[PDB]
DNA sequence: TCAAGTACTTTTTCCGG
RNA sequence: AGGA
DNA sequence: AAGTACTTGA
């Protein structure tokens, strides 16, 4: 039944998910427009922890002697203290990070940080480190503009929908929303410099890889997502063995849209 | 109706299916004694000849990509990116 | 809008469509004790202008058939006072994308 | 052996469109009928040798196409006809959408 | 092997469903189809100019078709006809016929409700050709009177005249293949109390339906071109050709006629009794008696498993197979012959695991490789290889079974007097044995996954089992307690590309089902991998050097 | 496989009416006044008077001989022999139809030169007559307006007898003196 | 809309209860398919199989002959867009490999 | 009469031809098929015009076989005869039944009865002739005929005609 | 006019006498 | 009547 | 094992 109901569903060349009638089922495959093969459980660091520890991790204040990036972290360090124009970029950055935190907390209400997302950023950084033999002693050759702006740029190229118009462009922004919270959380200035200790080259390479990887991760028009979905529920149903009616018989109850159900219950 | 080259908006990259069907097609054509657009550097299997043709983007084929409405965008195997 | 206590007799109900271009709505006071729109599972629905809809259809190369449907009688379709053919943009949160925008045409 | 419905599903799941066609056609059933372009039926008296085509009761000696369908489908169509249903087969479109 | 045809080859872009007009049936008909006798021209074994080939398709295998010439494999059947003595309901439409009567005037053929009723113009508005008919019926069923004058689209004082006729409409109920009404009546304003009880004849319903306006019937489901309502009532019956009802001709002088061949003879016989009965001194009851039976046979021929109990059982007890029965789900036409099919170039045996096979390979028994064949086109690249496989013949392993020339005809290397001296020409096809590294679809049923059918590299091996790498066990859900697996061989360079490029085992590693890998290290290898990787585990040089050599891609360091 | 046209008509089930073809200017479906060229534009029917037609084919075959040699790189009784040569060069021989056609047009043309066929075409396409009549007027040599109006019965009320007779005079004056 | 959310929640619960994991998208699609109609469309013969998709497609599941008889009676036109129709017709279904078309360009051919 | 018609023939080229002389092979194949052709629908397809500009378009590769299919859009000179058409032609055949007249690619036959009464068959002549008090209709003679009707036949169109009405006959 | 039983419908993994 |  | 549709008395 799951198969025969979903057979004719597939991703079209407009990233839309339609049936044999061309009736839209999903506007973008699985609300994100990604192929599930290219997805991995990743941590959204921005979501959890104390408001205090967030600040320690993410805050750069070039106008405070104890909250500036130490000149040990980057070469610019000494000439960076007090740069008001640069602080406008780090305020921009930190403001966006706090924005993300509140948004993520709206989405995942319990504060669940681990979500399946495309592009394993943890690994790109791991690999950037052995690839470039990152010296956790010497200071980076990165500018704040190099970091802040480079990340802002990479985001514009994380394409999922291509059309030149408001609807499709707003649609692209939407589809990419979460991935960028992750992106922004993992590529914040302090983080890049203090944690990853990346060089400009390492950083440029991390960025290029995220891009390439992301693009690969998108669903292929032609992908027969209907039969996939049907079988992806069908097969696990096969291996199946307060007290509410569950398992095979509840799944049965659900697909039938059974009115006179076995265990009705409210959770007040 | 046929979307103009300057108004195309489908992936600039080649889908898994496109590539599979191109290779299948060239392999079939090569196997049916069609003219080969590249030096077979000792090659004898028509699929391996096809992969060599697609490798040098020396395949004279065009993917006509139909949209749900019925319109379409034509893309050359020369122009499509092969990140697969 | 007629916010009635218990019932509106079938005699009186005959006068509801009797005065167009004006439109009339009947709401049982008890249904409105709680706002359904405020509920966890109930996302932001937005009514689209004739231009906004025309554009949505243009942008996705759609016939009205091809759009997902909201029933005229749907609790939110009633709250918003949706009429047949009117489109709602449903902006929901996503575990996948973060924010996902769906659309529904009225019945 | 049997290439059954569930096997068809996996093939559809993979997107192996040509491999699927091949299983249902070349590897099994595959047959050639001559159909009429007016009343899309298997009616055509194809005397393919003398090159005569014809579909009397259309008087159509001209507008005639050949098609490749599974013999089981040719059968199904003949069955549906025997039962007064006309599964008229057309080689062009009219609806668009 | 079908022959060249000048006709342009096209694909079915649309299927236009409809109903047969008796006129069409008569037009397309290559014969009528007058005698229940199958053949034996007065016992003389050859088809009678009456039933099966009175110009139809052909039997005998030898002896070409009488209308086209082609014969057997090439000749599709040719339809015939039988003119029915009285009109008869098509079983499948009885209720749709009833419902149409329920909607229209059984005297003038006008819709019982129209643009004057509001609820009607509301229901008429409905776009869906089925939902619109559904709403039209619920409204008009209740209307038991064809109205002459209805109140104007303003005042109930001035009643405007629509269509004529006053006539009270019968209250229709079915009595298994028969439609019987119960007209309300009048008699001193009351009556019923005891109404008019008479059965509605096929011919009267036909005549009512014939009078239903194009606009009216088009408002109901119907279409004026392909499906007019009058077509649910059968006047002229299409006779399906022998290919539909083939005679299972066991030996020479012994028939074996199909069920449908017999059921038609029944219809034909039932028709002649009625035809002669009415042309002669019509004993009027003996007529509606002979009519009812024709209605039964034409009914059971299409559908035998009817609500109204009698099951038209063949003299053998066994009930006759309906056409409906043929097409009916899982096993039979749609589901069994079309969505599923028994297929050539397929193999199946017991499966057993191999720790020495690569993940993406499949151990194929020599016998299975020696049977399954791939059609390779003689190209300058393969020309010499293929000539040797051809020379090797069908009995050696790397060999071939057939040589197909450009000139259609297929050379059987097994018997050909020229299996030795056979010079290949470019373009010819050599049907060679399945060889090491060919791509093949390997499957384990049930097939609830796309991974239950993956593409593998052939490895021809001894012993009668399909051998698989153990890590590929899980996706298929196979074990070696006596499981069996299916193997399918592609025939096109195109088809292989689909297998190798889309469904090959390594591609299938990380599945979208759960966004994680669907294959891993199992049993011995998992059990040993723990044992091997403890702090306590140390290996002497002798074994280290062997373990190193064992890695095929080892750097040599 | 045979040839198709610009006329897209959808003959769904409804076979017939295949109404008679006569010079009541009732030519085929295919030979309708409002044709459509491959560019999709509505264009009028092109009817050639044998003299006009001879020049078209000759031109086409001449330009063909040109490309055939380019791709190879890396007095009536006298026009008859000249054409018979071009056919043996450009046409696949087997086309006996074109060989007879050319000879027919060569022995039956009224106007030898392009200059001459020019003026004929102007003179006639001022009348507003249908392409068929405009051709028949150029290909059939008539003296009485009656000769013409009888042979081309379609003309009947379409032109003045005097107007037609003025045309016929000027058509005779254009007539090539072989 | 909330009907969809509960429908997923409830479906998801059956999977996670067994202790299994199915990626969101799959469950979403089923839940969405049941939902897009405007109400709850059952994954039954009297649910989905009674939509406006092609007769041959629909006839392949549960009500076969009855479906085809109705198709005839109401002169239904099969688009031939469904996988199922192409499997019945022995054609390359508009599925992955067959979701586009391949053409030879004489121009690019003479370029090489 | 004699038209210029925009037409299109679908050709199915085998892969072995997907070389540079592909357009050349296609254009040549079109002329093979189309040129010299005869339909009832279009008449005699005589000469394909503008060889240098024949529109080959893109060829769709047919799925199971490698061959590609092009719709070769072209323009040609056609000759489609009609009933009521008055035609000039030369006699060819001549018997006790009538005489056949060659008109371009087609032959129009005139029955002894579709002729005036006076013109009678004279068997005793080399070659057989028809004789009036004024005219002698024989093998080489030029005639003006009114086509009475046409019969669409395979690789031709044959027709019947009169020389009985006014302004028809010998020229 | 509407609740309740009535007719009566329909499916169910894969592969030798 | 059995097999996974 | 659970339905859709239709018909029956308050
Ligand atoms: Mg087992
Ligand atoms: Zn026909
Ligand atoms: Zn035959
Ligand atoms: Zn009436």
- Which DSSP category does H54 fall into? -
DSSP codes, E470-523: GGGHHHHT--SSS-EEEEE---SHHHHHHHHHHSBTTTTSB-TTTSSBS----H
Distance in angstroms (rounded) separating the CA atoms of residues A206 and A216:
15
DSSP codes, E49-114: SSSS-SSSS--SSSS--SSSS--SSS-----EEEEEEEEEE-GGGHHHHHHHHHHB-TTT--BSS-
The C-alpha R_g of chain E, in whole angstroms, comes to: 35
Helix (H) or strand (E) holding A175: helix A166-186
Residues F28 and F53 in one domain: no
Distance in angstroms (rounded) separating the CA atoms of residues E353 and E368:
17
Strands A114-118 and B61-66: unpaired
- Which resolution in angstroms does this entry have? 3.5
Between CA E338 and CA E347, with CA E344 as vertex, the angle to 5 degrees is 115
What is the topology classification, in CATH, of domain C35-107? Answer: Eukaryotic RPB6 RNA polymerase subunit (3.90.940)
CB E17 within 8 A of CB G57: no
Helix (H, G, I), strand (E, B) or coil at E301: helix
CB E377 to CB B27 under 8 A?
A: no
Q: Which residues of F touch D61 (CB under 8 A)?
A: none
Helix (H) or strand (E) holding F135: helix F131-139
Distance in angstroms (rounded) separating the CA atoms of residues A128 and H5:
69
Strands H156-162 and H106-111: parallel
The CATH number given to D1-85 is 3.90.1800.10
Distance of CA E159 to the CA centre of its chain: 55
For residue E329, report the distance from its CA to the centre of ligand 1, in Å: 29
DSSP codes, A226-243: HHHHHHHHHHHHHT----
- Whether residue G53 lies within 8 A of chain E, CB to CB, comes out as no
- Please state whether at least 3 CB pairs lie below 8 Å between chains E and B: yes
Q: Which residues of D touch E455 (CB under 8 A)?
A: none
Please name the residue of chain A whose CA is at the shortest distance from the CA of residue E507: A37
**HSE-CB for A229 with a 13 A CA cutoff:** 31
Domain residues of chain D, as ranges?
Answer: 1-85
Residues F39 and F64 in one domain: no
Distance in angstroms (rounded) separating the CA atoms of residues F7 and B33:
38
Distance in angstroms (rounded) separating the CA atoms of residues E36 and E264:
8
Two structure tokens written together for D56 = 């009397």
Q: Is the CB of G32 under 7 A from strand I?
A: no
Q: Which residues of H touch D62 (CB under 8 A)?
A: 40-41
Q: Is the CB of A256 under 7 A from strand K?
A: yes
Which residues in F53-64 are b (16+ Cβ under 10 Å) and which e?
A: bbbbbbebbebb
| Residue H88 to residues E429, F105, F121, F140, F145, Cα–Cα distance (Å) | 57, 11, 20, 8, 18
- Point out the ligand nearest to the CA of residue E143: 4
Two structure tokens written together for A88 = 């406008």
Other residues' Cβ atoms within 10 Å of the Cβ of residue H133: 6
Two structure tokens written together for E510 = 């990380």
Distance in angstroms (rounded) separating the CA atoms of residues F85 and F91:
10
- Point out the ligand nearest to the CA of residue E481: 1
Q: Bridge-partner residues for H159, per DSSP?
A: H108, H150
DSSP codes, chain D: -EE-HHHHHHHHHHT-HHHHHHHHTTTS--EEEEEESSS-STT---BTTTTB---TTTT-SSSEEEEEE-HHHHHHHHHHHHTTB--EEESS-S---
CB H160 within 8 A of CB H148: yes
Distance in angstroms (rounded) separating the CA atoms of residues E249 and E22:
33
Helix axis angle for F131-139 and F50-70, nearest 10°, is 90
Distance of CA A92 to the CA centre of its chain: 20
Distance in angstroms (rounded) separating the CA atoms of residues E282 and E515:
79
Helix (H, G, I), strand (E, B) or coil at G15: helix
Distance in angstroms (rounded) separating the CA atoms of residues H32 and H45:
11
For residue A2, report the distance from its CA to the centre of ligand 1, in Å: 26
Nearest to H93 by CA among H118, H113, H111: H111
Q: What share of chain G is helix, strand, coil (3-state, %, to 5)?
A: 55, 5, 40
Q: Is the CB of E483 under 7 A from strand J?
A: yes
Q: What is the sign of the dihedral through the CA atoms of E214, E215, E216 and E219?
A: positive
Which of G20, G32, G57 is closest, CB to CB, to A20? G57
How far from each other are the two terminal CA atoms of chain H, in whole angstroms? 20
- Top residue of G93, G102, G106 to mutate, by most chain B CBs within 10 Å, is G102
**What are the start-end ranges of the E strands in A96-244?**
114-118
Q: Which residues of B touch H58 (CB under 8 A)?
A: 62, 74
- Point out the ligand nearest to the CA of residue D45: 3
CB D14 to CB E327 under 8 A?
A: no
Q: Which residues of A touch D12 (CB under 8 A)?
A: 7, 224, 227
DSSP codes, A242-264: -----SHHHHHHHHHT-SS-SS-
Q: Which residues, other chains included, contact F29 with Cβ-Cβ below 8 Å and sequence gap of 6+?
A: F7, F9
- Which DSSP category does C32 fall into? G
For residue E108, report the distance from its CA to the centre of ligand 4, in Å: 4
Strands E361-365 and E346-353: unpaired
Distance in angstroms (rounded) separating the CA atoms of residues H101 and E507:
75
Distance in angstroms (rounded) separating the CA atoms of residues C74 and H87:
77
- For tokens 């005589």, name the residue: H46
CB E48 within 8 A of CB E32: no
Distance in angstroms (rounded) separating the CA atoms of residues H59 and H67:
9
Which residues in A77-90 are b (16+ Cβ under 10 Å) and which e?
A: beebeebeebbebb
How far from each other are the two terminal CA atoms of chain E, in whole angstroms? 60
- Which DSSP category does A127 fall into? H
Strands C69-70 and C98-106: parallel
Two structure tokens written together for E52 = 């099966």
**HSE-CB for D14 with a 13 A CA cutoff:** 35
The distance between the two most distant Cα atoms of chain D, rounded to a whole number of Å, is: 46
What are the backbone angles phi and psi of residue A36, rounded to the nearest 5°?
-50, -25
Q: Which residues, other chains included, contact A180 with Cβ-Cβ below 8 Å and sequence gap of 6+?
A: A155, A158
Two structure tokens written together for D4 = 């059954």
Q: Which CATH number fits domain H83-171: 2.40.50.140, 3.40.50.2000, 2.60.120.620, 3.90.226.10?
A: 2.40.50.140
Selected residues 223-252 of chain A with any CB under 8 Å from a CB in chain G:
223-226, 228-230, 232-233, 236-237, 239-241, 246-247, 250-251
Q: What dihedral do alpha carbons D38, D42, D45, D50 form, nearest 10°?
A: 90
Other residues' Cβ atoms within 10 Å of the Cβ of residue E236: 21
Number of H helices and E strands in chain B, helices first, is: 2, 2
CB C13 within 8 A of CB C24: no
- Which DSSP category does E552 fall into? T
What is the topology classification, in CATH, of domain B1-84? Answer: Eukaryotic RPB6 RNA polymerase subunit (3.90.940)
How long is chain A?
268
Two structure tokens written together for B81 = 């990116």
Two structure tokens written together for E550 = 């064992």
Distance in angstroms (rounded) separating the CA atoms of residues E362 and E440:
9
Distance in angstroms (rounded) separating the CA atoms of residues A102 and H67:
60
Q: Which residues surround ligand 4, an ion (CB under 5 A)?
A: E 105, 107-108, 146, 165
Two structure tokens written together for E62 = 């030898």
Distance in angstroms (rounded) separating the CA atoms of residues E245 and E57:
11
- Top residue of G84, G90, G100 to mutate, by most chain D CBs within 10 Å, is G90
CB E167 within 8 A of CB E187: no
Q: Bridge-partner residues for C70, per DSSP?
A: C106
Q: Helices in A23-140 by DSSP H: which ranges?
A: 51-58, 77-80, 84-107, 121-132
Nucleic acid strand J: bases within 7 A of protein CB: 3-4
Residues F106 and F24 in one domain: no
Q: Is the CB of A260 under 7 A from strand K?
A: yes
Helix (H) or strand (E) holding E267: helix E259-279
Q: Is the CB of A133 under 7 A from strand K?
A: no
Two structure tokens written together for E13 = 């872009």
What is the topology classification, in CATH, of domain H1-82? Answer: Dna Ligase; domain 1 (3.30.1490)
Distance in angstroms (rounded) separating the CA atoms of residues F24 and F36:
23
CB E457 within 8 A of CB E413: no
- Whether residue D94 lies within 8 A of chain B, CB to CB, comes out as no
The C-alpha R_g of chain G, in whole angstroms, comes to: 20
Distance in angstroms (rounded) separating the CA atoms of residues H33 and H31:
6
How far from each other are the two terminal CA atoms of chain A, in whole angstroms? 34
Two structure tokens written together for A70 = 């130490």
Which residues in H83-118 are b (16+ Cβ under 10 Å) and which e?
A: bbbbbbbbbeebeeebbbbbbbbbbbbbeeebbeee
- Which DSSP category does G68 fall into? H
Protein residue closest to J4, using CA and C1': E483
Protein residue closest to I10, using CA and C1': G62
Q: Which residues of B touch D15 (CB under 8 A)?
A: 16-17
Q: Is the CB of G62 under 7 A from strand I?
A: yes
Q: Which chains touch H (3 or more CB pairs under 8 A)?
A: B, D, E, F, G
Helix (H, G, I), strand (E, B) or coil at E358: coil
Distance in angstroms (rounded) separating the CA atoms of residues H14 and G108:
18
Q: What dihedral do alpha carbons H144, H147, H148, H151 form, nearest 10°?
A: 140
Q: Is the CB of G111 under 7 A from strand K?
A: no
CA of E350 to C1' of J1 (A): 21
- Cis peptide leading into residue E193 (ω within 30°): yes
Helix (H) or strand (E) holding E133: helix E131-142
Domain limits at F18? 1-47
| Residue E6 to residues D37, D92, H99, Cα–Cα distance (Å) | 15, 19, 36
Number of domains in chain F: 2
Distance of CA F109 to the CA centre of its chain: 11
- Please state whether at least 3 CB pairs lie below 8 Å between chains F and C: no
Two structure tokens written together for A78 = 């000494």
Helix (H, G, I), strand (E, B) or coil at A107: helix
Q: Bridge-partner residues for E160, per DSSP?
A: E150
Q: Is the CB of E482 under 7 A from strand J?
A: yes
CB A23 within 8 A of CB B69: no
Other residues' Cβ atoms within 10 Å of the Cβ of residue E126: 15
Two structure tokens written together for G7 = 């429908």
Domain residues of chain H, as ranges?
Answer: 1-82, 83-171
Please name the residue of chain G whose CA is at the shortest distance from the CA of residue A239: G18
Between CA E23 and CA D6, with CA D88 as vertex, the angle to 5 degrees is 140
What are the backbone angles phi and psi of residue A204, rounded to the nearest 5°?
-60, -40
Nearest to E77 by CA among F30, H101, B81, D46: D46
Two structure tokens written together for C74 = 């749907």
Domain residues of chain B, as ranges?
Answer: 1-84
Please name the residue of chain B whose CA is at the shortest distance from the CA of residue G109: B60
Two structure tokens written together for E40 = 């034996």
Q: Bridge-partner residues for C88, per DSSP?
A: C47, C104
């Amino acid at each position: 039944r799951l198969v025969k109901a979903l057979e004719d569903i597939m991703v079209h060349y407009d990233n839309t998910t339609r049936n044999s009638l061309g009736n839209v089922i999903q506007f973008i495959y699985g609300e994100d427009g990604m192929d599930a093969a290219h997805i991995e459980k990743q941590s959204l660091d921005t979501i959890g922890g104390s408001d205090a520890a967030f600040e320690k991790r993410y805050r750069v204040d070039l106008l405070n002697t104890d909250h500036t990036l130490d000149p040990s972290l980057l070469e610019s360090g000494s000439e960076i203290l007090g740069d008001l124009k640069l602080q406008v970029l780090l305020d921009e950055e930190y403001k966006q990070l706090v924005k993300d935190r509140k948004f993520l907390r709206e989405v995942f209400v319990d504060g669940e940080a681990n979500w399946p997302l495309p592009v394993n950023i943890r690994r790109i950084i791991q690999n950037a480190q052995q690839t470039f033999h990152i010296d956790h002693t010497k200071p980076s050759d990165l500018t704040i503009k190099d970091i802040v702006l480079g990340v802002k740029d990479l985001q514009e190229n994380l394409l999922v929908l291509r059309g030149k118009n408001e609807i499709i462009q707003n649609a692209q922004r939407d589809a990419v929303t979460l991935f960028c919270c992750l992106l922004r959380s993992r590529l914040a200035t302090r983080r890049v410099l203090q944690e990853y200790r990346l060089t400009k080259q390492a950083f440029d390479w991390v960025l290029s890889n995220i891009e390439a990887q992301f693009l690969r991760s998108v669903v292929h028009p032609g992908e027969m997502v209907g039969v996939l979905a049907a079988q992806s529920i069908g097969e696990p149903a096969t291996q199946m063995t307060k007290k509410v009616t569950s398992g095979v018989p509840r799944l049965k109850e659900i697909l039938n849209v059974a009115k006179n159900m076995k265990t009705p219950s409210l959770t007040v | 109706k046929a979307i103009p080259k300057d108004q195309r908006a489908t992936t600039p990259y080649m889908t898994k299916y496109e590539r599979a069907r191109i290779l299948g097609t060239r392999a079939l054509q090569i196997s049916m004694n069609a003219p080969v657009f590249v030096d077979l550097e000792g090659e004898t299997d028509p699929l391996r000849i096809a992969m060599k043709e697609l490798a040098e983007k020396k395949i004279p084929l065009v993917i006509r990509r139909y949209l749900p409405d019925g319109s379409f965008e034509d893309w050359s195997v020369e122009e499509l990116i092969v990140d697969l | 809008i007629f916010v009635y206590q218990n019932n509106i007799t079938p005699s009186a109900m005959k006068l509801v469509p009797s005065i167009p271009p004006a439109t009339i709505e009947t709401f049982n006071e008890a249904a409105l004790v709680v706002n359904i729109t405020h509920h966890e599972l109930v996302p932001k629905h937005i009514r689209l202008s004739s231009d906004e809809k025309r554009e949505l259809l243009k942008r996705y190369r759609l016939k009205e058939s091809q759009l997902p449907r909201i029933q005229r009688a749907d609790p939110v379709a009633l709250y918003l006072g949706l009429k047949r053919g009117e489109v709602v943009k449903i902006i929901r949160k996503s575990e996948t994308s973060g924010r996902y925008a769906s659309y529904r045409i009225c019945m | 052996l049997r290439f059954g419905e569930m096997e068809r599903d996996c093939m559809i799941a993979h997107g192996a469109a040509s491999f699927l066609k091949e299983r249902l056609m070349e590897a099994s059933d595959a047959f050639r009928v001559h159909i009429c372009g007016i009343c899309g039926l298997m009616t055509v008296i194809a005397k393919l040798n003398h090159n005569q085509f014809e579909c009397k009761g259309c008087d159509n000696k001209i507008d005639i196409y050949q098609i490749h369908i599974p013999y089981a489908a040719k059968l199904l169509f003949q069955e549906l006809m025997a039962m007064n249903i006309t599964p008229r087969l057309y080689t062009d479109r009219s609806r668009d959408f | 092997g079908q022959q060249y045809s000048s006709a342009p080859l096209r694909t079915v872009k649309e299927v236009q469903f409809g109903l047969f007009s008796p006129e069409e049936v008569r037009a397309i008909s290559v014969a009528k189809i007058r005698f229940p006798e199958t053949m034996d021209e007065t016992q003389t074994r050859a088809k009678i100019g009456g039933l099966n080939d009175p110009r139809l398709g052909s039997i005998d295998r030898n002896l070409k078709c009488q209308t086209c010439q082609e014969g057997m494999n090439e000749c599709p059947g040719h339809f015939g006809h039988i003119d029915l003595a009285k009109p008869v309901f098509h079983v499948g439409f009885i209720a749709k016929i009833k419902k149409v009567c329920e909607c229209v005037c059984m005297h003038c053929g006008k819709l019982l409700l129209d643009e004057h009723n509001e609820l009607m113009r509301q229901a008429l508005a409905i776009k869906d050709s089925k939902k619109r008919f559904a709403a039209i019926w619920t409204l008009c069923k209740t209307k038991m009177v064809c109205e002459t004058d209805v109140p104007s689209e303003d005042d109930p004082t001035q009643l405007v005249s629509r269509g004529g006729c006053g006539n009270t409409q019968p209250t229709i109920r079915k009595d298994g293949l028969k439609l019987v009404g119960s007209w309300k009546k009048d008699r001193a304003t009351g009556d019923a109390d005891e109404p008019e009880l008479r059965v509605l004849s096929t011919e009267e319903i036909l005549n009512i339906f014939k009078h239903i306006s194009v606009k009216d019937f088009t408002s109901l489901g119907f279409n004026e071109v392909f499906s007019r309502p009058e077509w649910m009532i059968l006047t002229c019956l299409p006779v399906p050709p022998p290919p539909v009802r083939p005679s299972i001709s066991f030996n020479e002088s012994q028939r074996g006629e199909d069920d449908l061949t017999f059921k038609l003879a029944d219809i034909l016989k039932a028709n002649i009794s009625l035809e002669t009965l009415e042309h002669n001194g019509a004993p009027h009851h003996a007529i509606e008696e002979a009519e009812s039976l024709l209605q039964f046979h034409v009914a059971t021929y299409m559908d035998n498993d009817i609500a109204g109990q009698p099951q038209a059982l063949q003299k053998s007890g066994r009930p006759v197979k309906s056409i409906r029965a043929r097409l009916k789900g899982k096993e039979g036409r749609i589901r069994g012959n079309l969505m599923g099919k028994r297929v050539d170039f397929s193999a199946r045996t017991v499966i057993s695991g191999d720790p020495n096979l690569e993940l993406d390979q499949v151990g194929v028994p020599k016998s299975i490789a020696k049977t399954l064949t791939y059609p390779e086109v003689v190209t300058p690249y393969n020309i010499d290889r293929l000539t040797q496989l051809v020379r090797n013949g069908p009995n050696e392993h790397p060999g071939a079974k057939y040589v197909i020339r450009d000139s259609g005809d297929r050379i059987d290397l097994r018997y050909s007097k020229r299996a030795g001296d056979i010079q290949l020409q470019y373009g010819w096809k050599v049907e060679r044995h399945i060889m090491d590294n060919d791509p093949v679809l390997f499957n384990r049923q049930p097939s609830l996954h796309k991974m239950s059918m993956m593409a593998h590299r052939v490895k021809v091996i001894p012993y009668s089992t399909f051998r698989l790498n153990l890590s590929v066990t899980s996706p298929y859900n196979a074990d070696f307690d006596g499981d069996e697996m299916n193997l399918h061989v592609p025939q096109s360079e195109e088809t292989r590309a689909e297998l190798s490029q889309l469904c090959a085992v390594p591609l299938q590693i990380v599945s979208p089902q759960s966004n994680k890998p669907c294959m891993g290290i199992v049993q011995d290898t998992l059990c040993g991998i723990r044992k091997l990787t403890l702090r306590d585990t140390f290996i002497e040089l002798d074994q280290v050097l062997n373990m190193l050599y064992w890695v095929p891609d080892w750097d040599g360091v | 496989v045979s040839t198709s046209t610009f006329q897209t008509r959808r003959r769904r089930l409804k076979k017939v009416e295949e109404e008679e073809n006569a010079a009541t200017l009732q030519l085929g479906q295919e030979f309708q006044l409002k044709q459509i060229n491959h560019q999709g534009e509505e264009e009028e029917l092109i009817a050639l008077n044998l003299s006009e037609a001879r020049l078209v084919i000759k031109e086409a075959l001449v330009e063909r001989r040109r490309a055939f040699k380019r791709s190879q790189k890396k007095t009536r009784e006298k026009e008859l022999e000249s054409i018979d040569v071009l056919l043996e060069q450009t046409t696949g021989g087997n086309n006996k139809d074109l060989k007879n056609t050319m000879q027919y047009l060569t022995n039956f043309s009224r106007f030898r030169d392009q200059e001459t066929v020019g003026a004929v075409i102007q003179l006639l396409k001022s009348t507003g007559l249908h392409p068929f009549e405009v051709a028949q007027l150029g290909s059939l040599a008539c003296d009485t307006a009656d000769e013409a109006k009888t042979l081309i019965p379609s003309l009947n009320n379409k032109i003045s007898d005097d107007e037609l007779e003025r045309i016929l005079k000027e058509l005779s004056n254009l007539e090539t003196l072989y | 809309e909330a009907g969809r959310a509960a429908l997923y929640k409830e479906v998801y619960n059956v999977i996670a209860s067994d202790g299994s994991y199915v990626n969101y998208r799959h469950m979403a699609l089923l839940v969405d398919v049941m939902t897009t109609q405007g109400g709850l469309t059952s994954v039954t013969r009297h649910g989905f199989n009674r939509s406006n998709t092609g007769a041959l497609m629909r006839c392949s599941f549960e009500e076969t002959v009855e479906i085809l008889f109705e198709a005839g009676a109401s002169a239904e036109l099969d688009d031939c867009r469904g996988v199922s129709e192409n499997v019945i017709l022995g054609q390359m279904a508009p599925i992955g490999t067959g979701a586009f078309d391949v053409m030879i360009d004489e121009e690019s051919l003479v370029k090489y | 009469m004699f038209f210029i018609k925009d037409l299109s023939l679908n050709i199915t080229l085998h892969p072995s031809f997907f070389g540079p002389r592909m357009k050349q092979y296609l254009k040549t194949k079109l002329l093979e098929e189309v040129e010299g052709s005869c339909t009832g629908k279009f008449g005699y397809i005589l000469c394909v015009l503008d060889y240098d500009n024949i529109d080959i378009q893109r060829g769709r590769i047919l799925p199971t076989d490698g061959s590609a299919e092009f719709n070769v859009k072209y323009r040609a000179v056609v000759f489609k005869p009609f009933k009521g058409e008055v035609v000039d032609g030369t006699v060819v055949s001549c018997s006790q039944h009538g005489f056949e007249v060659q008109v371009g690619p087609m032959k129009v036959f005139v029955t002894k009865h579709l002729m005036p009464q006076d013109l009678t068959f004279n068997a005793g002549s080399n070659p057989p002739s028809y004789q009036s008090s004024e005219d002698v209709i024989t093998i080489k003679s030029r005639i003006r005929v009114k086509i009475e009707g046409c019969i669409s036949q395979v690789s031709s169109i044959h027709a019947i005609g009169s020389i009985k009405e006014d302004y028809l006959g010998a020229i």
